[model samples]
Target: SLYKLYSMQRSGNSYKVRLALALLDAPYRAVEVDILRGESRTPDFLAKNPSGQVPLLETAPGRYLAESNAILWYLAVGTSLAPDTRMDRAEALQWMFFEQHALEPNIGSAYFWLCLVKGGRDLQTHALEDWLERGYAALQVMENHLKTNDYFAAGQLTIADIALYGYTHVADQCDFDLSTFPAVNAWLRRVEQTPGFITMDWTP
Candidate 1:
């Protein structure tokens, strides 16, 4: 299969898919798209993904997939990153859903306002605390569960960890103090040491 990943360097969602491909030892090419420069909105790119989102996967000739979590699910099936038990699979999905709805919204938004935009902080000052509070709450939930379990589901490294790790690894960039969540901190170390694991800046 000829796989091409359309992504930006700093996107956690892209990192999620990239990390999975690395862990799976899959060979693929990276196509960098500068969303900041409106590359994602061009007619050519829009023809592939109407949402104009990054982290899109091109599986084959003219076959494209959007949504980071959905791409993870597609690539992980039958791989070691997939859960063994049906129940475990459901649980993995549970955490992935939490990541998208709860975790990413807060942390991702913070990164957008605090780091990505040059003058975002001054403009979004009033909403900063709200984002941090919610983001921390989401991190605490993961930290509490990780205090006992090594991984999010199936008691092993799975896509759930990959999904969360993408953003959590860069929490500091969003001004999140990862030290407060020791379990989460430890878990991050575990993922980082996993064979074939790659950092967010990794390309192709």
Candidate 2:
């Protein structure tokens, strides 16, 4: 019996967990939850995760894990996905933080509002644009960094790559022109070429 992973299809946050599991070669049974129906908001699910989020990992029979980044750290602790040196470990965390603060805020928000919002939904364009602009700026930073380094942290593949891969792979959904960032685009393709890489859609 494998650990159980609960997630929504196509969710960037959920995709992170799934990708980490694949990279770790850890056996896991994924339970698809419906984000459109607000399945993650149910009382039962909320009890499992006070955040009421998907991508929850049930490791042991009654044990549970929450937060995509937290889960990634957990899954990669003893694996090659995580670097061993203290400096390297700090670098991984730094890049992961960059993903959340500098990258996800803009790209993640834009994708959520533009693509996933219901037809009748009300979205704040100003807020979305704020995020898109920031996302592009963050992409430029990545482009420059990747121009010389093969990977984000310590020049080797790490959980940092998995954290950002979710949205960076499909940034076009937010109208972000990836073609402008040659090095970033090259880095993305390199990630796809990594062994055990799982797409954001969960296809092998």
Candidate 3:
């Protein structure tokens, strides 16, 4: 039996987990959980995952996991998805945390406001502006880092790439212009060319 992955389609956080699984050629089943529809808040679903979040991975008969980045770490163990060196691994963890806390909040919030909510509508213009500014600033940091190296937190690809890829690839949906960052654009192309590298279209 394949590992069952519970996630909602079109969710960038869920895409991070899905993309890592595919890149590793891991056999898994995809279960669509309606996050926006409140399917993730059900008693049964919450029982399986107390955290009540999509992108939950059932790796074995009884073993389960939650959190997109955490799932990536667990599933990626013993694979190139994880690094061996102490400092490299630490850096990977650092970047992943940065992505979830510093990066995702801004970028993810912007996306939610622009696309999912009132069609890029915000009752408070400045409330939305703060998030947009932070999101763009975060992108600028990535652009600067990428200008120096191909990937962040190490010389080659790492979980950091997967974490940031969740939103940066689709940042334009929030009215953020990616064309201004040449290095980031190049890095995106490199990531897209990887084999079995599926686009973030929510297709199997």
Model 3: lowest-lDDT 10 consecutive positions = 117-126
The C-alpha stretches of model 2 lying farther than 4 A from their native spots are 120-122
lDDT of 3 by residue, 82-199 (tens): 8889899898888898888766787887776676655446544666767778887888888888988888766877778888888888888777888798998898887778777876
Q: List the residue pairs that clash in candidate 3.
A: none
Query: On residues 65-130, what C-alpha lDDT tens digit does candidate 2 reach at each position?
Result: 987888899899988888989999999999899998986787887777767767412556558667
lDDT of 1 by residue, 1-204 (tens): 459999888777888999999999988888999888999999999999998989899987888999899999999999999988899999999999999988788888888778877788998888889888998999999999998999999999999999999778878877899878999999999999999999977667
Question: lDDT (0-100) at residue 170 of candidate 2?
Answer: 71
lDDT of each: 0.89, 0.83, 0.81
Clashing pairs for predicted structure model 2, backbone only: 106-131
Candidate 3 deviation (Cα RMSD) = 1.7
Q: Whole-model lDDT, candidate 3?
A: 0.81
Off by over 4 Å in 3: 118-120, 123-126
- Residue 10, model 1: lDDT of 79
Better of 1 and 3 by lDDT: 1
Cα lDDT, model 2, residue 182: 84
Off by over 4 Å in 1: none
Worst 10 residues of 2 by lDDT: 117-126
